[PDB]
């Protein structure tokens, strides 16, 4: 569904969209080249998913490696203050989003 892909990608650039489509088509073609019938070629949603996940780093987008680097042991609720701070951050987030 084109609508799902359009909704998912945000702050992308046209060049990046073309790169995504090329990546998906290349992945499908290489899968069939691996084969076990070159006439039943098709592109599957799984190819889009994998290509988006493991490639295409939008310049104005969100990275995950930096997160994985900064936070390294998750969060353990050892007392009230952690809950207090987490619950208070959402107020600022909402204020900046709505007003």
């Amino acid at each position: 569904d084109i609508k799902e892909l359009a909704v998912e990608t945000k702050n992308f650039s046209g060049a990046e969209l073309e790169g995504l489509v090329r990546a998906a088509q290349s992945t499908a073609m290489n899968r069939h080249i691996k084969a076990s019938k070159a006439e039943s070629l098709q592109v599957t949603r799984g190819d889009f998913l994998a290509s988006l996940e493991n490639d295409i780093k939008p310049a104005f987008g969100t990275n995950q490696e930096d997160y994985a680097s900064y936070i390294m042991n998750g969060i353990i609720k050892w007392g009230d203050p952690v809950t207090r701070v987490l619950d208070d951050g959402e107020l600022l987030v909402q204020q900046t989003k709505n007003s």
Partner: protein, 92 residues
């Protein structure tokens, strides 16, 4: 001596062959020379025709399947049986 990679439409060769060699005999393994647009080609008979035959007669209503010879640089584009498709995947 005059090999080239220039693209030549195959349908033109098919029509010229049918028109020029109408009512002619061809046997498997036979060789002949075909004149097309003031150029000479060495044609080798490979298969003749669902009954299978080794020697037969050329008629206007027949079909012709041109296949470029081994290592031939001739780019036989068009609607003929140039064998431009590598069935399955070579996967070197």
């Amino acid at each position: 001596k005059n090999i080239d990679s220039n693209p030549y439409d195959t349908d033109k060769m098919a029509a010229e062959f049918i028109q020029q060699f109408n009512n002619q005999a061809f046997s498997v393994g036979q060789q002949l020379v075909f004149s097309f647009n003031d150029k000479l080609f060495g044609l080798l008979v490979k298969d003749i025709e669902r009954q299978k035959i080794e020697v037969g007669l050329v008629v206007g209503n027949s079909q012709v399947a041109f296949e470029k010879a081994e290592n031939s640089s001739l780019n036989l584009i068009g609607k003929a049986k140039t064998k431009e498709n590598r069935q399955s995947i070579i996967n070197p």
